[PDB]
Amino acid sequence: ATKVVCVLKGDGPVQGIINFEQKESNGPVKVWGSIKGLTEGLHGFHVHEFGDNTAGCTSAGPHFNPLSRKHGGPKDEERHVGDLGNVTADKDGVADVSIEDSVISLSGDHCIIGRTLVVHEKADDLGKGGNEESTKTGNAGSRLACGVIGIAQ
Amino acid sequence: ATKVVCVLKGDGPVQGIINFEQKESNGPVKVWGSIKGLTEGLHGFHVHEFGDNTAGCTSAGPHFNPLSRKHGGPKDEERHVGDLGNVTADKDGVADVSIEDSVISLSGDHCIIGRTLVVHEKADDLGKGGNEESTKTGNAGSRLACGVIGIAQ
Ligand SMILES: *[Se]c1ccccc1C(=O)NCc1ccc(Cl)cc1
Ligand SMILES: *[Se]c1ccccc1C(=O)NCc1ccc(Cl)cc1
Ligand SMILES: [Zn+2]
Ligand SMILES: [Zn+2]
Ligand SMILES: [Zn+2]
């Protein structure tokens, strides 16, 4: 019943369309779509706090973290609301995104609408990388593409 | 105390940053910023319903119209919520945007977050143009630049 969309673009060749759908307010959000122009392997995939693209992906700020928790993977209890883990690109540089998440929402306090979806340079280590940066950003590095998360038909 | 932003980009050289700020949920929204690469004169300036830029500005859909009213100018009681009238570009193609609106909001049912801001090819006639199209789109024509309205710091 609620649908939102995000068009990912950046400075490089990284570009994608990501769809979100939530059938009930207390329910999981299905996240699906395609990103191309990635290097083979894992790329960190986060909702960032600000829907602000004024100076590219950098104005999106840190991980969307309304509950003031530490960084984790999508399937940890200890995670930022915006922690969607990694998408995986093949030798062709295509990541086929198919995620179900119960922590993000398309309504209420956990609502991601008007925030930024970012795909990262490197792998999110999901907070288990063994430095301080792991429990903040997960060491996923630079922002390759982003977009503001918007209300869909 | 609520701040949102929108980066306008399109198929052409039209580009802009537009800021929105609302001190209280019951209060007016101040809208300000700059757009460049416009032709001299009036350009229709609307919040459209969907924050969907999957196929450029066209996927934004019609005027944000949660109350099912006819098109008007910002000063009319009969207006779409998204009816922000016109911005005016000079010989230099720059529009200095300075608007105060009491109908848009950054919270509640009239909330523009996650919707699309669009600047148009032509003048919005503010519903007084004397055809049926005036009461729907205001005859402002093509979409030159748009962006999704996002949460700011
Ligand atoms: Se998303 C969200 C978070 C917190 C409070 C309210 C809301 C919300 O309901 N947003 C407005 C809206 C309107 C239509 C659609 Cl399809 C989605 C969201
Ligand atoms: Se107002 C609104 C419209 C569409 C989607 C969500 C919302 C919303 O209320 N989100 C909660 C919110 C809004 C602004 C800020 Cl700064 C924080 C949280
Ligand atoms: Zn990130
Ligand atoms: Zn995080
Ligand atoms: Zn209208």
mmCIF file of C-alpha atoms and ligand atoms in Angstrom:
data_model
loop_
_atom_site.group_PDB
_atom_site.id
_atom_site.type_symbol
_atom_site.label_atom_id
_atom_site.label_comp_id
_atom_site.label_asym_id
_atom_site.label_seq_id
_atom_site.Cartn_x
_atom_site.Cartn_y
_atom_site.Cartn_z
ATOM 1 C CA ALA A 1 0.000 0.000 0.000
ATOM 2 C CA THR A 2 3.009 2.387 0.512
ATOM 3 C CA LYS A 3 5.579 2.637 -2.331
ATOM 4 C CA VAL A 4 8.660 4.916 -2.508
ATOM 5 C CA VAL A 5 11.501 5.059 -4.969
ATOM 6 C CA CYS A 6 15.101 6.268 -5.199
ATOM 7 C CA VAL A 7 17.200 7.107 -8.298
ATOM 8 C CA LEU A 8 20.937 6.657 -7.496
ATOM 9 C CA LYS A 9 23.396 8.859 -9.419
ATOM 10 C CA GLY A 10 26.897 10.161 -8.627
ATOM 11 C CA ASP A 11 30.131 11.630 -10.105
ATOM 12 C CA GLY A 12 31.178 8.286 -11.665
ATOM 13 C CA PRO A 13 29.416 5.582 -13.753
ATOM 14 C CA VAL A 14 27.439 4.232 -10.739
ATOM 15 C CA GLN A 15 23.660 4.486 -11.289
ATOM 16 C CA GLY A 16 20.613 2.586 -10.053
ATOM 17 C CA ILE A 17 16.866 2.521 -9.374
ATOM 18 C CA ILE A 18 15.742 1.161 -6.006
ATOM 19 C CA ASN A 19 12.074 0.529 -5.096
ATOM 20 C CA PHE A 20 10.650 0.159 -1.562
ATOM 21 C CA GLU A 21 7.223 -1.313 -0.714
ATOM 22 C CA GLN A 22 5.461 -1.711 2.659
ATOM 23 C CA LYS A 23 2.054 -3.436 2.727
ATOM 24 C CA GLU A 24 1.270 -2.486 6.379
ATOM 25 C CA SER A 25 2.768 0.055 8.834
ATOM 26 C CA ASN A 26 3.994 -2.660 11.249
ATOM 27 C CA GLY A 27 5.233 -4.824 8.365
ATOM 28 C CA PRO A 28 8.511 -5.446 6.523
ATOM 29 C CA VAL A 29 9.694 -3.237 3.644
ATOM 30 C CA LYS A 30 10.646 -5.036 0.405
ATOM 31 C CA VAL A 31 13.602 -3.305 -1.282
ATOM 32 C CA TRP A 32 14.391 -4.264 -4.937
ATOM 33 C CA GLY A 33 16.074 -2.897 -8.036
ATOM 34 C CA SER A 34 19.320 -2.714 -10.009
ATOM 35 C CA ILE A 35 22.604 -0.823 -9.718
ATOM 36 C CA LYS A 36 25.254 -0.849 -12.503
ATOM 37 C CA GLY A 37 28.853 0.451 -12.942
ATOM 38 C CA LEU A 38 30.088 -1.120 -9.658
ATOM 39 C CA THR A 39 33.313 -3.137 -9.193
ATOM 40 C CA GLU A 40 32.820 -6.894 -8.495
ATOM 41 C CA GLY A 41 31.997 -7.580 -4.814
ATOM 42 C CA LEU A 42 30.254 -6.059 -1.799
ATOM 43 C CA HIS A 43 29.229 -2.373 -1.683
ATOM 44 C CA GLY A 44 27.878 -0.758 1.488
ATOM 45 C CA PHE A 45 24.201 0.220 1.170
ATOM 46 C CA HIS A 46 22.867 2.769 3.713
ATOM 47 C CA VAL A 47 20.025 5.240 4.317
ATOM 48 C CA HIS A 48 21.787 8.454 5.401
ATOM 49 C CA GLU A 49 20.122 11.054 7.631
ATOM 50 C CA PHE A 50 19.650 14.040 5.252
ATOM 51 C CA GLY A 51 17.833 14.198 1.873
ATOM 52 C CA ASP A 52 20.376 16.927 0.991
ATOM 53 C CA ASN A 53 22.232 16.593 -2.359
ATOM 54 C CA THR A 54 23.513 20.226 -2.410
ATOM 55 C CA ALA A 55 27.197 19.113 -2.550
ATOM 56 C CA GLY A 56 26.700 15.621 -4.034
ATOM 57 C CA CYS A 57 26.461 12.563 -1.752
ATOM 58 C CA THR A 58 28.590 14.204 1.005
ATOM 59 C CA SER A 59 25.704 16.509 2.157
ATOM 60 C CA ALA A 60 23.671 13.355 3.050
ATOM 61 C CA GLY A 61 25.552 13.276 6.396
ATOM 62 C CA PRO A 62 25.967 10.126 8.556
ATOM 63 C CA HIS A 63 23.871 6.909 8.765
ATOM 64 C CA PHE A 64 20.156 7.513 9.570
ATOM 65 C CA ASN A 65 20.284 6.699 13.314
ATOM 66 C CA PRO A 66 17.146 8.037 15.066
ATOM 67 C CA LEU A 67 17.527 5.577 18.016
ATOM 68 C CA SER A 68 21.222 6.503 18.701
ATOM 69 C CA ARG A 69 22.605 2.965 18.235
ATOM 70 C CA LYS A 70 26.009 1.775 16.937
ATOM 71 C CA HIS A 71 26.624 0.553 13.342
ATOM 72 C CA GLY A 72 25.712 -3.060 12.484
ATOM 73 C CA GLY A 73 24.399 -5.321 9.734
ATOM 74 C CA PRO A 74 20.713 -5.482 8.745
ATOM 75 C CA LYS A 75 20.286 -8.563 10.753
ATOM 76 C CA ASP A 76 21.808 -7.305 14.051
ATOM 77 C CA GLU A 77 19.673 -5.858 16.910
ATOM 78 C CA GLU A 78 22.540 -3.337 17.317
ATOM 79 C CA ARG A 79 22.260 -1.370 14.037
ATOM 80 C CA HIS A 80 21.409 2.108 12.760
ATOM 81 C CA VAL A 81 17.862 2.255 11.223
ATOM 82 C CA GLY A 82 19.691 2.992 7.884
ATOM 83 C CA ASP A 83 21.976 -0.084 8.011
ATOM 84 C CA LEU A 84 20.960 -2.189 4.950
ATOM 85 C CA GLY A 85 24.308 -4.054 4.802
ATOM 86 C CA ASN A 86 25.773 -4.680 1.323
ATOM 87 C CA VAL A 87 24.644 -5.193 -2.254
ATOM 88 C CA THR A 88 26.826 -7.523 -4.330
ATOM 89 C CA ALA A 89 27.989 -6.673 -7.864
ATOM 90 C CA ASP A 90 29.024 -9.408 -10.360
ATOM 91 C CA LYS A 91 31.920 -9.318 -12.912
ATOM 92 C CA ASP A 92 29.495 -7.274 -15.106
ATOM 93 C CA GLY A 93 29.325 -4.624 -12.338
ATOM 94 C CA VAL A 94 25.549 -5.191 -11.840
ATOM 95 C CA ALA A 95 24.037 -5.564 -8.337
ATOM 96 C CA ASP A 96 20.564 -7.144 -8.334
ATOM 97 C CA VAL A 97 18.989 -5.792 -5.161
ATOM 98 C CA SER A 98 16.409 -7.906 -3.338
ATOM 99 C CA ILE A 99 16.159 -7.117 0.406
ATOM 100 C CA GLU A 100 13.449 -7.469 3.071
ATOM 101 C CA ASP A 101 13.900 -5.296 6.188
ATOM 102 C CA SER A 102 11.743 -4.919 9.347
ATOM 103 C CA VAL A 103 13.645 -1.947 10.852
ATOM 104 C CA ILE A 104 13.280 0.705 8.101
ATOM 105 C CA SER A 105 9.701 1.931 7.624
ATOM 106 C CA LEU A 106 7.735 4.002 5.121
ATOM 107 C CA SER A 107 5.838 5.636 8.017
ATOM 108 C CA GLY A 108 6.355 6.838 11.616
ATOM 109 C CA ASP A 109 9.659 7.541 13.440
ATOM 110 C CA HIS A 110 11.692 4.982 11.401
ATOM 111 C CA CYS A 111 10.459 6.545 8.135
ATOM 112 C CA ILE A 112 13.118 6.816 5.402
ATOM 113 C CA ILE A 113 11.142 9.142 3.097
ATOM 114 C CA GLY A 114 13.088 12.323 2.287
ATOM 115 C CA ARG A 115 16.404 10.800 3.466
ATOM 116 C CA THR A 116 19.262 9.661 1.179
ATOM 117 C CA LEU A 117 20.067 6.111 -0.059
ATOM 118 C CA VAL A 118 23.848 5.755 -0.710
ATOM 119 C CA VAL A 119 25.864 2.962 -2.340
ATOM 120 C CA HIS A 120 29.495 2.878 -1.180
ATOM 121 C CA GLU A 121 32.994 2.325 -2.649
ATOM 122 C CA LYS A 122 33.762 -0.737 -0.498
ATOM 123 C CA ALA A 123 32.219 -3.518 1.641
ATOM 124 C CA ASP A 124 30.349 -2.640 4.841
ATOM 125 C CA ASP A 125 31.922 -4.850 7.364
ATOM 126 C CA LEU A 126 28.758 -4.785 9.394
ATOM 127 C CA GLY A 127 30.514 -3.490 12.555
ATOM 128 C CA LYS A 128 32.735 -6.593 12.928
ATOM 129 C CA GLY A 129 35.891 -5.235 11.200
ATOM 130 C CA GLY A 130 37.896 -4.696 14.431
ATOM 131 C CA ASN A 131 38.444 -0.936 14.497
ATOM 132 C CA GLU A 132 36.367 1.978 15.889
ATOM 133 C CA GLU A 133 35.356 3.048 12.358
ATOM 134 C CA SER A 134 33.619 -0.389 11.938
ATOM 135 C CA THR A 135 30.981 0.553 14.572
ATOM 136 C CA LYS A 136 30.358 3.928 13.025
ATOM 137 C CA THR A 137 30.482 3.639 9.198
ATOM 138 C CA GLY A 138 31.522 -0.030 8.754
ATOM 139 C CA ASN A 139 34.548 1.133 6.640
ATOM 140 C CA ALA A 140 32.505 1.222 3.380
ATOM 141 C CA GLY A 141 34.454 4.312 2.245
ATOM 142 C CA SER A 142 33.412 6.911 -0.320
ATOM 143 C CA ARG A 143 29.880 7.485 -1.708
ATOM 144 C CA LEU A 144 29.641 6.358 -5.364
ATOM 145 C CA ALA A 145 25.949 7.190 -6.019
ATOM 146 C CA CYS A 146 22.945 8.474 -4.030
ATOM 147 C CA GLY A 147 19.442 9.904 -4.281
ATOM 148 C CA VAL A 148 16.602 11.259 -2.144
ATOM 149 C CA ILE A 149 13.998 8.657 -1.199
ATOM 150 C CA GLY A 150 10.665 9.782 -2.666
ATOM 151 C CA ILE A 151 6.936 8.926 -2.574
ATOM 152 C CA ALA A 152 5.879 6.763 -5.547
ATOM 153 C CA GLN A 153 2.537 6.079 -7.218
ATOM 154 C CA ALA B 1 13.205 24.389 13.307
ATOM 155 C CA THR B 2 12.176 22.142 10.356
ATOM 156 C CA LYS B 3 14.443 22.544 7.300
ATOM 157 C CA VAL B 4 14.184 20.736 3.919
ATOM 158 C CA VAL B 5 16.067 21.223 0.656
ATOM 159 C CA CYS B 6 15.616 20.504 -3.060
ATOM 160 C CA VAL B 7 18.282 20.364 -5.810
ATOM 161 C CA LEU B 8 16.665 21.132 -9.221
ATOM 162 C CA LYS B 9 18.295 19.534 -12.296
ATOM 163 C CA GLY B 10 16.900 18.598 -15.751
ATOM 164 C CA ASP B 11 17.607 17.653 -19.421
ATOM 165 C CA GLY B 12 18.771 21.251 -20.115
ATOM 166 C CA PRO B 13 21.168 23.794 -18.338
ATOM 167 C CA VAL B 14 18.394 24.638 -15.774
ATOM 168 C CA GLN B 15 19.695 24.097 -12.214
ATOM 169 C CA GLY B 16 18.856 25.455 -8.753
ATOM 170 C CA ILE B 17 18.985 24.971 -4.981
ATOM 171 C CA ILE B 18 15.748 25.716 -3.106
ATOM 172 C CA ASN B 19 15.520 25.793 0.715
ATOM 173 C CA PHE B 20 12.343 25.434 2.811
ATOM 174 C CA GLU B 21 12.060 26.371 6.525
ATOM 175 C CA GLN B 22 9.106 26.097 8.949
ATOM 176 C CA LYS B 23 9.518 27.364 12.543
ATOM 177 C CA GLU B 24 6.299 25.701 13.840
ATOM 178 C CA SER B 25 3.996 23.019 12.363
ATOM 179 C CA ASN B 26 1.053 25.490 12.299
ATOM 180 C CA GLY B 27 3.219 28.208 10.719
ATOM 181 C CA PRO B 28 4.231 29.501 7.263
ATOM 182 C CA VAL B 29 7.061 27.922 5.215
ATOM 183 C CA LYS B 30 9.739 30.302 3.902
ATOM 184 C CA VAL B 31 11.040 29.208 0.534
ATOM 185 C CA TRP B 32 14.272 30.722 -0.831
ATOM 186 C CA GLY B 33 17.132 30.024 -3.183
ATOM 187 C CA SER B 34 18.419 30.528 -6.729
ATOM 188 C CA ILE B 35 17.763 28.964 -10.147
ATOM 189 C CA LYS B 36 19.922 29.683 -13.253
ATOM 190 C CA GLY B 37 19.705 28.811 -16.999
ATOM 191 C CA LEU B 38 16.061 30.003 -17.368
ATOM 192 C CA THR B 39 14.685 32.233 -20.158
ATOM 193 C CA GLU B 40 13.699 35.785 -19.038
ATOM 194 C CA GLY B 41 10.201 35.988 -17.445
ATOM 195 C CA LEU B 42 7.764 33.858 -15.416
ATOM 196 C CA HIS B 43 8.249 30.114 -14.868
ATOM 197 C CA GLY B 44 5.626 27.955 -13.161
ATOM 198 C CA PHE B 45 6.845 26.626 -9.808
ATOM 199 C CA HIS B 46 4.963 23.608 -8.385
ATOM 200 C CA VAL B 47 5.282 20.777 -5.872
ATOM 201 C CA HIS B 48 4.237 17.661 -7.819
ATOM 202 C CA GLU B 49 2.691 14.598 -6.170
ATOM 203 C CA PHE B 50 5.427 11.922 -6.512
ATOM 204 C CA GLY B 51 9.109 12.044 -5.474
ATOM 205 C CA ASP B 52 9.719 9.768 -8.469
ATOM 206 C CA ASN B 53 12.424 10.887 -10.935
ATOM 207 C CA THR B 54 12.806 7.407 -12.541
ATOM 208 C CA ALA B 55 11.978 8.854 -16.013
ATOM 209 C CA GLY B 56 13.118 12.453 -15.335
ATOM 210 C CA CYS B 57 10.590 15.124 -14.322
ATOM 211 C CA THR B 58 7.665 13.353 -16.060
ATOM 212 C CA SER B 59 7.405 10.597 -13.358
ATOM 213 C CA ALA B 60 6.598 13.363 -10.777
ATOM 214 C CA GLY B 61 2.937 13.178 -11.881
ATOM 215 C CA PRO B 62 0.463 16.099 -11.524
ATOM 216 C CA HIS B 63 0.371 18.962 -8.978
ATOM 217 C CA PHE B 64 0.435 17.819 -5.307
ATOM 218 C CA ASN B 65 -3.338 18.105 -4.619
ATOM 219 C CA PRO B 66 -4.238 16.203 -1.412
ATOM 220 C CA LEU B 67 -7.528 18.197 -0.976
ATOM 221 C CA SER B 68 -8.804 17.511 -4.554
ATOM 222 C CA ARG B 69 -9.118 21.224 -5.481
ATOM 223 C CA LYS B 70 -8.681 23.034 -8.823
ATOM 224 C CA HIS B 71 -5.460 24.827 -9.864
ATOM 225 C CA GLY B 72 -4.918 28.421 -8.671
ATOM 226 C CA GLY B 73 -2.257 30.902 -7.588
ATOM 227 C CA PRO B 74 -0.564 30.783 -4.153
ATOM 228 C CA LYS B 75 -2.925 33.560 -2.960
ATOM 229 C CA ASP B 76 -6.202 31.747 -3.882
ATOM 230 C CA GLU B 77 -8.318 29.589 -1.491
ATOM 231 C CA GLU B 78 -9.001 27.423 -4.575
ATOM 232 C CA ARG B 79 -5.464 26.105 -5.260
ATOM 233 C CA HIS B 80 -3.617 22.782 -5.197
ATOM 234 C CA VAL B 81 -1.362 22.499 -2.075
ATOM 235 C CA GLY B 82 1.593 22.452 -4.560
ATOM 236 C CA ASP B 83 0.604 25.717 -6.315
ATOM 237 C CA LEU B 84 3.548 28.082 -5.631
ATOM 238 C CA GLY B 85 2.757 30.332 -8.624
ATOM 239 C CA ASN B 86 5.767 31.600 -10.611
ATOM 240 C CA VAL B 87 9.408 32.494 -10.132
ATOM 241 C CA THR B 88 10.736 35.280 -12.333
ATOM 242 C CA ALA B 89 14.035 35.022 -14.224
ATOM 243 C CA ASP B 90 15.965 38.162 -15.330
ATOM 244 C CA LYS B 91 17.935 38.822 -18.598
ATOM 245 C CA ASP B 92 20.758 36.817 -16.942
ATOM 246 C CA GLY B 93 18.397 33.790 -16.661
ATOM 247 C CA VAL B 94 18.598 33.856 -12.813
ATOM 248 C CA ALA B 95 15.455 33.538 -10.641
ATOM 249 C CA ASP B 96 15.944 34.722 -7.042
ATOM 250 C CA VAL B 97 13.337 32.735 -5.136
ATOM 251 C CA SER B 98 11.832 34.299 -2.021
ATOM 252 C CA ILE B 99 8.366 32.942 -1.161
ATOM 253 C CA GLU B 100 6.319 32.619 2.034
ATOM 254 C CA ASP B 101 3.483 30.072 1.895
ATOM 255 C CA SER B 102 0.916 29.068 4.548
ATOM 256 C CA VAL B 103 -0.589 26.119 2.592
ATOM 257 C CA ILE B 104 2.476 23.873 2.040
ATOM 258 C CA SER B 105 3.831 22.312 5.243
ATOM 259 C CA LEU B 106 6.926 20.379 6.360
ATOM 260 C CA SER B 107 4.636 18.178 8.516
ATOM 261 C CA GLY B 108 1.129 16.647 8.505
ATOM 262 C CA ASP B 109 -1.167 15.953 5.519
ATOM 263 C CA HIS B 110 0.101 18.997 3.533
ATOM 264 C CA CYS B 111 3.713 17.810 3.926
ATOM 265 C CA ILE B 112 5.866 18.248 0.787
ATOM 266 C CA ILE B 113 8.727 16.039 1.971
ATOM 267 C CA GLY B 114 9.514 13.257 -0.535
ATOM 268 C CA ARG B 115 7.501 14.992 -3.302
ATOM 269 C CA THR B 116 8.988 16.752 -6.363
ATOM 270 C CA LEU B 117 9.605 20.510 -6.866
ATOM 271 C CA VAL B 118 9.406 21.398 -10.621
ATOM 272 C CA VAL B 119 10.226 24.600 -12.489
ATOM 273 C CA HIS B 120 8.292 24.924 -15.765
ATOM 274 C CA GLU B 121 8.956 26.079 -19.364
ATOM 275 C CA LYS B 122 6.355 28.873 -19.265
ATOM 276 C CA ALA B 123 4.248 31.119 -16.992
ATOM 277 C CA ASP B 124 1.615 29.631 -14.683
ATOM 278 C CA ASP B 125 -1.441 31.678 -15.408
ATOM 279 C CA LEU B 126 -2.617 30.932 -11.918
ATOM 280 C CA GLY B 127 -5.916 29.381 -13.122
ATOM 281 C CA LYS B 128 -7.139 32.676 -14.700
ATOM 282 C CA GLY B 129 -6.054 31.778 -18.290
ATOM 283 C CA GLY B 130 -9.582 31.057 -19.600
ATOM 284 C CA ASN B 131 -9.353 27.406 -20.695
ATOM 285 C CA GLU B 132 -9.858 24.075 -18.855
ATOM 286 C CA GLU B 133 -6.078 23.445 -18.816
ATOM 287 C CA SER B 134 -5.628 26.656 -16.713
ATOM 288 C CA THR B 135 -7.752 25.063 -13.931
ATOM 289 C CA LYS B 136 -5.481 21.944 -13.985
ATOM 290 C CA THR B 137 -1.825 22.802 -14.882
ATOM 291 C CA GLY B 138 -2.088 26.596 -15.417
ATOM 292 C CA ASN B 139 -0.562 26.106 -18.943
ATOM 293 C CA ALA B 140 3.046 26.238 -17.593
ATOM 294 C CA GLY B 141 4.162 23.620 -20.151
ATOM 295 C CA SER B 142 7.197 21.331 -20.035
ATOM 296 C CA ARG B 143 9.280 20.496 -16.919
ATOM 297 C CA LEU B 144 12.746 22.126 -17.221
ATOM 298 C CA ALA B 145 14.263 20.998 -13.866
ATOM 299 C CA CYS B 146 13.101 19.065 -10.797
ATOM 300 C CA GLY B 147 14.262 17.301 -7.673
ATOM 301 C CA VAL B 148 12.980 15.346 -4.689
ATOM 302 C CA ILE B 149 12.292 17.400 -1.565
ATOM 303 C CA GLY B 150 14.560 16.180 1.228
ATOM 304 C CA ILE B 151 15.136 16.543 4.980
ATOM 305 C CA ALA B 152 17.978 18.977 5.773
ATOM 306 C CA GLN B 153 20.257 19.535 8.764
HETATM 307 SE SE1 LIG C 1 6.908 8.745 6.459
HETATM 308 C C1 LIG C 1 6.342 9.443 7.779
HETATM 309 C C2 LIG C 1 7.123 9.495 8.935
HETATM 310 C C3 LIG C 1 6.683 10.083 10.123
HETATM 311 C C4 LIG C 1 5.422 10.662 10.197
HETATM 312 C C5 LIG C 1 4.576 10.668 9.088
HETATM 313 C C6 LIG C 1 4.981 10.077 7.877
HETATM 314 C C7 LIG C 1 4.026 10.142 6.719
HETATM 315 O O1 LIG C 1 2.917 9.652 6.880
HETATM 316 N N1 LIG C 1 4.400 10.843 5.626
HETATM 317 C C8 LIG C 1 3.489 11.392 4.617
HETATM 318 C C9 LIG C 1 3.209 10.442 3.465
HETATM 319 C C10 LIG C 1 2.126 10.654 2.620
HETATM 320 C C11 LIG C 1 1.861 9.770 1.563
HETATM 321 C C12 LIG C 1 2.700 8.667 1.353
HETATM 322 CL CL1 LIG C 1 2.417 7.492 0.016
HETATM 323 C C13 LIG C 1 3.766 8.445 2.225
HETATM 324 C C14 LIG C 1 4.024 9.332 3.257
HETATM 325 SE SE1 LIG C 2 6.122 15.555 6.820
HETATM 326 C C1 LIG C 2 6.512 14.210 6.021
HETATM 327 C C2 LIG C 2 6.154 14.018 4.660
HETATM 328 C C3 LIG C 2 6.497 12.874 3.952
HETATM 329 C C4 LIG C 2 7.212 11.864 4.587
HETATM 330 C C5 LIG C 2 7.602 11.969 5.918
HETATM 331 C C6 LIG C 2 7.295 13.100 6.671
HETATM 332 C C7 LIG C 2 7.748 13.142 8.111
HETATM 333 O O1 LIG C 2 7.017 13.639 8.958
HETATM 334 N N1 LIG C 2 8.929 12.623 8.454
HETATM 335 C C8 LIG C 2 9.440 12.719 9.816
HETATM 336 C C9 LIG C 2 10.469 13.830 9.886
HETATM 337 C C10 LIG C 2 10.301 15.000 9.145
HETATM 338 C C11 LIG C 2 11.245 16.014 9.205
HETATM 339 C C12 LIG C 2 12.370 15.847 10.004
HETATM 340 CL CL1 LIG C 2 13.606 17.138 10.079
HETATM 341 C C13 LIG C 2 12.545 14.686 10.749
HETATM 342 C C14 LIG C 2 11.597 13.676 10.688
HETATM 343 ZN ZN ZN C 3 27.164 5.173 4.079
HETATM 344 ZN ZN ZN C 4 25.303 2.463 10.168
HETATM 345 ZN ZN ZN C 5 -1.824 23.274 -9.505
#
